[model samples]
Structure formats: structure tokens, C-alpha cells
Target: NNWVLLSTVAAVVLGITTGVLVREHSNLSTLEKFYFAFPGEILMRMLKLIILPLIISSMITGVAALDSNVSGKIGLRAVVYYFATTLIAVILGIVLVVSIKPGSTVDAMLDLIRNMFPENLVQAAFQQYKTKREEYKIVGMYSDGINVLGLIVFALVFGLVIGKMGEKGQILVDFFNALSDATMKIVQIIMWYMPLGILFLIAGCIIEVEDWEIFRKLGLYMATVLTGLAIHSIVILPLIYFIVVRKNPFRFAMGMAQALLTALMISSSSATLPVTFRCAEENNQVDKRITRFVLPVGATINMDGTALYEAVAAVFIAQLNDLDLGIGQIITISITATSASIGAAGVPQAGLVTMVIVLSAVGLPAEDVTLIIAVDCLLDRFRTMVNVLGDAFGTGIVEKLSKKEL
Candidate 1:
């Protein structure tokens, strides 16, 4: 059953109670308000606390595990395939969303985006939780002058160098590894509260939907994005397997189920690295060299689902605003979507920021971000599955192309 469905039931009950028992103009009681905010805030804090160290340590460990020669091959093949397929995904999303124009009737619904933020976009992103503000500040401090690209570059360099240091690096590596391990355990602990978290999160969303009709229209847009994701995960990726490895993609996919499920639940490719690499080696029989060299790099850079979703979202928003993008603009979407997707860290809500980056590159409003946040969590679960699919497929493709002598 969809967890969101469970949340919806809670929303319906809350709505009825408010309509019957509570006065229409009355604010939530102090206790009710805390009940509403606390779970989400705690959940966000737990996620934020894990993200930075999880990314840095996981990236370092993954890179460090690879031998030099294999590392070079993995880097070359993974980068080429990652960019190529991600470009294809973005184009697919753009084409589908443009054809359907899900937002065509949403011109009057512009207020949804307008009220999406509390005050400022950046502050709003942080206001979700204190830990998030800390993460933003850390990234901001290093980025200096609002250079997200620079921060990413530094992270990649730092991780790669730390990975390359071998024995001397192991001490620091172990420390980070321990931290990563502990953080994951903490996340597992928090997931027990997911039902309540989901209830609050979804109820909050349901209360905000002034026009349920928008959701009906969103179904097609959601379907298109999901169909695109399914095609990449089921059709395109398996074809890559057959063409490259001449192996049964079904068995490969089945073997990856645990890893895929983990990614789905977490909605983070980086957080799923340990499982991804393990599945690549133990189940798929991928060479350790390939698993070590390819999967990590793929986790960081290959984001077919995100690339595709961002394209769909950008086009949908543009259509809502009656903006007709030219061929050049579409091409620009492809390029920026590809680059931005690669640069996106595998963290929850990171996609929203990444989409902002891609849209801003094409002169779209960042405020339009809130328009998608409503469905983002639900979509993220599916997107995450496709992301792992892409990551696993990239590993398979590179491993084959490299003909890694192991």
C-alpha cells in the first residue's frame, strides 16, 4: 500500500473534524500546532544531520576503494555514459511534458506558487529545520558568493584526494566511515516514526490545496514523469544490459531489489551507496573493481530521474506562465539539466534546489519551486527508484565497456 494513502486517510479525518468540530476561523490549538510541526521538524533535522557527513564520507570511501587504473577507466566511462543517458532522460521529459502541457489550464492557479514560500526562498528552505540551516550555512560558507558549483567541485576534489591517500587516509576514512555508519543507524531509528511524520507532512499538504482540481491535472503530468522514469528503469536500462553485457536484465534487476528498495525508502542515491556497491558485487557479479570504481561515481553524478523530472517540471511551470520556450531554450534545458543533475548531491529536497539551478539558468523564477514541493516527496520515492536503476545500469555499462580485466 502507498504510505501516502495512509496519510491521506489521516488528512480526511482531520479535515472532517475541523469542518464539524472546530470553528472555521479558529487557529489550531497550541498543542495541535506542535503536533503538526514537531514530527516534520524532527524528521528534517535527522535527515539534515546525516546528509553532509554521509555524502563526504561515502564519496571518499567509494573513491578510495578503487585502484588507480580502474579508477581512471571508471571515471572516463561513467562520466561519458552518465552525461549521455541523463541528456536523453531530460529530453524525454521535456518532450512529454510539452506535448501534454499539464499546466495549460493552470493560469489562474499562479497563486499556488506565490504562497509556496514563507518569506524568502533560501530562508524558507532552511526554516524546515535548524539542522538544514546549518547544512545551508556550511555549504554557503565554503561556496562564498553563492557558488554552489564551487562547493561541489571542492567536495569532489576533497573526496577523491582523500580516497587516493590509501593507508594514511584510512584513519580519517575510518572515522568518517564510523560516522556514516552511526548516522544510518540513526536514520533507521527515525524511520519508525515515519507513519506519524507522513501523517503530519501529508495533512499539512492536504490543508494547503485550495483547489483539488490542480491535483487532477497533475495526475497526467505525474503519469508522464513516472512513465518516463519507468521507461528508463525497465526498458532503456535493460537494453543497455543486453547490448553491453549480453546478460539477463531481469535477474540483474531482481538481484538489485534490496538496493532499490533501500534507495526508495531513503530517496537518496548517496545514502544507498553501501547497498548499491554490495548489490553490484554480490548479486550482479560485477567486478569489485567496477563496483568500487563505477558505482560511487555513478551515485554522485548519474541522475536520470532527476534530469528528466527537472525538465518536466520546468516545461510544466513555463506552460503555466504562458511561456513558450524556443528551440534554443529547450537545448539549453538539456545542457543545464544534464550538468545540474550531475552536480546534485544525493540528498532529499536537494532536487528542488537542483531544479531551481536549472530553471534559473534558463531564466525561470526560483519562486516557482514551491509549486512542486507538494508532490515532491511522493515523486521523490519513485524518482529515487529510477535513480538507483540508472546508477546500477551505469555501473553495468561501464563495467562492460571497460572490459575490466579485473
Candidate 2:
């Protein structure tokens, strides 16, 4: 009851605050604007500060939980199948969006959208990005803004290698476990300011999005992404469970509803990790060891929601630009979406940034990302719920597989 009440209050507050921001547009002092911006920036930074440690700990623990005694065959099969299915899911999303031609309709509205987000609006959106772009240089890649993807890759590989080390790795495992616990504590502390952070994030979004004209024009593109996400979550994923685990998927979903709702309101997979992990273990009957491991890793890396979004966004951009992607380009999108999805942790707009990468891979404009950002925040809450559900489902499947082996 407390959880339900708290969530309802947060929703009411968000709706009311956004309404106020949208309705009142008197010129604001610089100080007032900054005050409105501070909480969102702070929340983003706090999450960023914890990303590296959290991913490292979660990945290492996930791999380690397979048990040193378990045959390498079992672990390898599970990991390979998990990634393979995720890649397939992403591809299916792209195909579905393209065949539906959602972007064909949105193409006519591109010019309007570009003009709507004037130079001032673009500048304001990027105002906080003052750090030298060169500071984000990758060894093989170009120097640019923060290389969040680069950071995520480094953490994943480091964590995986650490997980593979046997009894000799106990010390490292213990250290990361302790680190993960501390990070969770930090996340709890961060949540104390969540109301303030959410208020600013929503207020700023409302202030910038004062006009409803864009939604009317881009409604199809919005619907495409939404419909694709729904099919992926409700239809495709359940079929995966039915075929793979031979269980009642609807029953599983009902059991996981609480975690799903919590994720929807919070809009952060990392923030929802505690609830997701608990639900997987207690209500879903996922093995305790697997829940503790795969879930944390999935929260960081296996973002089914982000992957699906990247696919739809990539195809949408191609359509908007009046570009016809050949088979080779579509293949490029598939590979890029998979790799980029694997490396999207640590950034606030990870999915949007990944959309940039996907667009670039197929020679689409980077600015095309802005097309989705307006709707992205609104859709993120639902997608975040999908992400948590996907993670919980994966953990449950792995648990069932382990029991079969026993």
C-alpha cells in the first residue's frame, strides 16, 4: 500500500508540475532557469558516477555465479543464446517498423521539426556540454564528446575476465561485491532527492516543448516506436519464454507487475534493480544465485528496450532523410544496434546517443537523433519497464535451465 501510494503521489506531482511549466511562460531569470536545471543534471551525474563500478561488479558477479564447477559448455551456451536472441529481437523490430512505413509519413514533417527547434533551442539543449570534445577521444575512434560507449566496453571486458578467473579470483570478486553493495547504498541516498530531480527534468521538458504541433506531425513515428515496443514486450518476448521455457508467460508477467510498475515511474533500470532482483527471486521463483547475477548484468548491458528503440530510430531517420537503405546498410544497422546497445550504460540519454551511432553507421544525419528525443522521454518510462521485465524473464529462464541440469 505504501509503495502504491508513493507512486501515485509522484505521478500526481509530475503531472501538476509539468502543467504549471507549460501554462506559465513568463520570461524567467537566469537564476530561475538554473535552479530548474540543477536537479536533473545532478541526478544524471550521480547515476554516471556509479555506472562504472556497478557494471563491473554486476558483470563479474553474473559470470561468477555460473559456478566454477559448472561445465563451460553450459555457461557458454546460456551467454551465447542470450545475446543471439537479443540481436534477433532488434532485427525484427527494424523490419517491422520499415514494413509498416511509419517513417514515410513523418518524412514530410522533418522540415517543420528542424525549424521548430531553433538555433537557440539547440544551443540551450547543449549548453551544459562545455567540456572539450577532444577529452572524449578513443584510441581508434575520433576525438569527440564523452566516449560513454568506450567506457562501458572497458568495464564489461574487465569484469568478464575477472569472472573467468577461478578460486584465485575470490579476492577480486569479494572486492566488487562489496563495491556493488556500496553503490546500491549510494543509489538509495540519491533517491532521497528523486522528487526534486524528477520535478526539474519534467519541468524543463515541458518548458521546451510548449508547442503541441510537433506531436501532431510526428505522431506516426511516435506510434511506430510505441507499437513496435509493445509487440516486442507483449508478443515477441512471451513467445520466447513459451518456446524456451515451456511456462505460462502471462502468469509470469502478472507475477512481475509490481517490478514493472516501479520501473515505469522511476525510469531507471539501475534504480529498479533492487525491486527486479527481489521479484525474480521471491515471486518468480528464479534461482537466487542467477537472479543476483544475470539481473544486474542485464540492467547494465542487455537492454532489450534500448535495443528495440535503436532499431526503430535508425530506420526512422533513414526514412526522414529520404534515403533507401540497401541490404548491406540494413545489415550494418543490425550490427551497430547490437554493439551499441551493449555499450549504452553510464550515459543519461544512452538510447538517444546510440541512435546517433546507428544513424551514423548507415550514413544518416546525427541531428536526426533530436527527432526522437522529444518523444523519447515520454516513451522511456514504458521502455524502462520493458527493460526490467526482460531482465527478470531472462533470469527466470536461466534458473529453470540450471534446475534441469541438476
Candidate 3:
């Protein structure tokens, strides 16, 4: 735990130093930048590689482990808890962004109107979706740009089918149990490289920014999102945990320090799930049954951070474009952001992909996505931290509730 925390701080310091040096040194070549950035790219890919299989195996084993009566009741409570928190997050984000009016400057608004709306890109994305839709195959359903909801649906049905097989189900359950353990081992192996991986990921993102002015321009916007995340993670989540379980929130936070730090650096809740599982079970003493079921599903579908960001980003863009969103549209934004965030892959920049879905749903220009891309990488880190924290909180709460008669 000490090493993990130390490495995280070291990575941030080193990454920032490298980014500053690269930015000031005009003589640095593209090859030099790529040389420094390649490790992070590989790290991200490795994390992505495990996501689909991990989700499938973990969800199956989690559901299969539960008895039929307990499964339905627990699953229902978990889903309700997830959706409720997500909705509150979205609402909080909307309120903050609206009150802050982060993009209110004349120049920012003009820049957004002129450059943010990209009809061509939106058309191209839709065209690609259409092409992929026509050629979809079950065997290839796990490919890039695949519908995550579809994959989740398939896993649930498959798990339920196995659950009904009685004694035969035990064999498949054992297989997935082994698969889950193996996948977590792979995750643990990958995590050993995290500090270095994070250094490259963070530094590469800074180097890729075309100008420091982008940060200056987006400072208020960034603050708005961060403030919302801080409020949600620090105050709201811990308060709920205290209320529900009468646990010391600070102690709970300390127990989750390793997992939260990993989420902060890696910015991928799915990738951070192994550590979360360990921390929740070993550190926080959440029941193994609750951790197994809640954490995996939460990592995949319980995206409080992503949902909040989408609401804030969508409204910020709309405000920047001088589009006066009606109450109806605001409500639409909340619903769409909440729904879009569900089943969003827990990866760095995954929110950006789903943000477009939210924008399109509310009649906002999908092209406006480019406006926020500049700072998404940075905001992603904080939001991912909140995401993992939320999952941990849910695990703790659900475990406490399960122990009672209800």
C-alpha cells in the first residue's frame, strides 16, 4: 500500500516534469515523443484486452454463485442503488455546470460556435455505425465499437441459463470461477507496471495538447467538473455510507486508498476492479458474496462519474453554442446522460465516446465533442477515482444491508 501510494505520487511528478520539458523544447522530434508515449499506449491496450473477457467471466461467476432467491433480490437492490446514485450524480453535475456557467466568455462561446459543431464527423460516425450494424455477427460481437449493452445482455442470459441447469451449472460455474481468478491474476501482473504506465499516459496527454492556451481557456470548465466530482466522491458517497452502515467514512476511505489511487492513475474502473475487489474484501471486510457481485457489475454499469461528466459537458457545450436549453431539454439531458453512461466500458476516454450519445439524444450537435476533448484526459482521472469510490461504497452498503433481515 505504501509503495502504491509512493509510486502514484512519483508518476505524477515525473509525468508533469517530462510534459513541461517536452513542451518547452521545440527541437524534440515526433519520434522522441512516440518513444516516450509508446509504453502508455501499450498499457492501455493491455487493459482493454482484458475488459471484455473479465466482464463476461466475472459477471457469470458472480451471478452463478448466488442462490436463485437471493440473486433476484440482491440484483434488484444493487441495480436500484446504482441507478439512483447515477441519477443524483447527473443532477448534481447539471446544477453545478449551470450555476458556474463555465463557458460564458464571449471568445469561448464564439470558438465553440465556429469550431465545435462538426456535421461531417457526426455523419461519418453514423455511417460507420450503419455499416457495422449491417455486418454484425455474434462471433464478432466483441469487436471494437461493439454495443456494450448487447454484450452485457448476453452475459446475463448466459449466466441465468447456466444457473438453471442445477448440478450441471456447477461445472460451468467452476470454469468461470477459475477464469475470473486467472483474469484477476493477469490484472495484478499488469498493475505492477502501473506507475510507469501512468507516467507515460499522463505525460503523453500533456505533450499532445497543441497549446497551453487550451488549458487556460478550459480552466473554469475543468474546475466545474472537478468540483462536482469532489463533492460526489468526498461528501455524498461517504455520507451515504455513514448513514447506511454507521461506518467511519474516513476509515473506509483509508481502506480504499490503494484502489482509489490506482483508479486515479489508470483512469479505468474495469482495469482497477482487481484491486477494488481485494481492498473491499480484505481491507474493508465487505462480504465476499457482495464484493463479487456488486463490484464487477458496478465497474461495468454503475458509472456515476461518467454520467455526471456527460451532463456537465453536454450542458456546457450547449451553453457555449448559445443554445438556450429548455427545462424539457435539461430533463432529456439527465435521462440520456444516465442511460448512455450505463454499460459504458470503464476505460480512459470512454466517457468521450458516450458523451456523443448524450449530445445526440438531446438534439445538441454531436460535433461539439471536440470542444471538450482537450481536457477530457485530465478530467478522466478524477472521475475514474470517483467511479471506483462509488463502487466500493455500494459494496459496503449492500453487504451491511444483506446481513440484516431485509
Candidate 4:
């Protein structure tokens, strides 16, 4: 584990250095440069290959497993708070991304509506709703790229129906559970390739740049995300805790130092849950009942930092192509970013794959993800840190609000 982590961080620095040296010192032919990033292309392809299965299994298993377990007012509260907080996180992200420069408002809405209700389930798997001009007025047609939104809606509702079926539903539930395990095993295998992938990805993107101002643009990108993250965790979430609990929220926040640091280093919410629990139970003394129940679900669904980062990234890609966004695309980014983040499984590699989902949702090139992977490691840590903090705030706020119910 340590070796892989070291290799990844090492890949970042080495890739950047190699890219810079090669770009300045030796001239590379266009074909040579193309060949340079070929491995990275495979990485993208591999990630894309897994998207449908990952979404289906992750979404279905997630909702189905939590079904009857959640009952009464407290359960209802947690679910609402869970979705509510993430929505705010996404809206905040959308505003900042658009404020920085982010889309059209109408066709994208209709596109999503079509995506929500797929005419043919099989067709929805690889074709999204696209509006185009057919030389006369306008035409709506299916385009290449997975209709991820369609699958997302279907899987969510499918999970709901299973949850309603009680014992009869578990056969299907167990199937998706088995499916999810298999998917993550594949995800684990993919993890080993990441460092090598990042290396070639970074080097190639650097070479691909016609002018070398990407890092500067990238600098601003990180600045905006961290700024959004800082404000969200340090201000909005804490104040919510303070208002609900009537205590020193920052002091409450200060207690989770161990979990936060682990989150920073590990950068995987699913992996960091043990440390988070220890911090909550031993350090902050949050109720065992609340901490245990909320944190797991929170890890799965409540990704404030990732939500912000994805929204910002989709816009950043638009900026790279020098396309000024319209309202429809902006609305698409906001909705899709939330869906992508919510749909993401709690793991190390899922972040980038989910980014591809949002990119495709906004009709951007998924390959452009390589352009931002260079800075992902650093932003990844910062994002994970806020992610853990939001979970902490959530348990704190939830426990206080449900005082009588608990």
C-alpha cells in the first residue's frame, strides 16, 4: 500500500519533470508525442469501460442495502440531511465554477428529461440525448457516449422497488452486492496501473500543450476549488453545527485532527472510516449509535469536496477549449456533478472515473481529464480532508437535532 502511494506521488513529480525537460530540450514529432500518451489513452479507456457496471452495482447496492435499515423519523432525517447537504455542496460548486466561467439552460434540461426516462434501456446505455440542427429547425437524437444519467435514474428507482419488496427483494439485493464486490476488485486491479498511467498522462498532456500557460490556468483551478472547499467546510458546515448544537463548532471540529490527517494522506473516505470512527468515539465522544450509522452512508454519498471539484473541473475543461458556456450546459454541469459525486463509490480511483462521467454529461471530451490529473494529487488530499470534515459535521449536527428521537 505504501509502495503504491509512494509510486503515485513519485509519478506526479517525475512526470512533470520529464515532460518539461523533453518539451524544452528535444523536439518531439506530433506522432511521437501522440505515441507518448498512448498508455494514458488505455487508462482512460479502461476507466470508461467500467463506468456502466460501476454505476449500476454501486447505485443499486447502495440504496438497496440501506432500505429497511432506515426507519422512523431519525432515519428520514439522516436521508434528507444527507441529500440536502450534498445538494448545497453542489450548488455552491456550480456557482463558483460558473462565476469563474462555466453553460446553456434549456436544451440541456430537455436532454436530462429525456435521459431521466429512457425510451429503450439498452439504447440508453451508450447513447445520450443530443439536440442538433438538421438544416431545417432542430432535431433531437441519440449521440455516442453512455447515457449515464439514464442508467443512474433507472438503477436508483430499481433499488427503491427492491427495498420495498422486503425478503423477496434480497435475491436481487445479494446479486448486486456480489456485483459490487466484483466491480471493486476490478477497481483494485486498476489501482496498480494508476501511477504508471499518471506518469504517461501527465507527460503527454504537458507535451500536448501548444503554449505553456496550463499550469497557471491550473493554479487558478486549484485555487478556486480549495477556496470553495475552505468556505464550505470551515464556514457553512461548522455554522450549521453551531446553530443546531449551540456549541463551539470549531472546537468540535478541532477534535477530529487524527481522522482529518488520515483522510489527507489516504485520500479515500471508505478507507479512512476506521480512523474517523476512532476520532469520533474516543476523541469527540460522539454517540456510538449516530457515528456508526451516519459515517458509512456519509462515506458512500456525502462527498462535498468531490462534488465541488467535479463541477469546477467540468467548467475548467470548457475553459480550456475557450468555449463560453450557456445556461443549459451550466445547469447540466450542476445536476450531473451532483449525480456523479453521489453515484461515485467510495474508493481511491473512482474520483477520476467520476470526472469522466461529468465531462461526458456536459458533452466535453473525456480525454481532457489528463489535462487536470497533474494537479489531482494535491487537490485530492485537500478534497478528502474536507470530505471527512463534512462527515464529522454531519454526525454532530444529526445527533443534536435528533436528541429526542434517538
Alpha-carbon lDDT of model 2 = 0.66
Please give each candidate's TM-score: 0.74, 0.83, 0.85, 0.69
> How well does candidate 2 match the true structure in TM-score terms?
0.83
**Candidate 2 regions off by >4 Å?**
1-21, 24-35, 71-74, 104-165, 346-348
Worst 10 residues of 1 by lDDT: 138-147
Give the lDDT of residue 142 in candidate 1: 17
Per-residue lDDT of candidate 1, residues 10-57 (tens digit): 543554454333424546665665565566557566666665555555
Compared with the true structure, the alpha-carbon lDDT of candidate 1 equals: 0.65
Q: Which stretches of candidate 1 lie over 4 Å from their true place?
A: 1-37, 104-149, 162-199
Q: Give the number of the best model, judged by TM-score.
A: 3
lDDT of every predicted structure (CA atoms): 0.65, 0.66, 0.78, 0.73
Candidate 3 regions with alpha-carbon error over 4 angstroms: 1-5, 27-36, 104-144
The window of 10 residues in a row where model 3 has the poorest summed lDDT is 124-133
lDDT of 1 at 390: 83
Best by lDDT: 3
Global local distance difference test of model 4: 0.73
Alpha carbon deviation, residue 188, candidate 3 (Å): 2.3
- Across 182-279, the per-residue lDDT of candidate 4 in tens digits comes to 86678557667867776777777677766657567688788778888988888888877888889998888778877786666546676556667777
Poorest stretch of ten by lDDT in candidate 2: 124-133
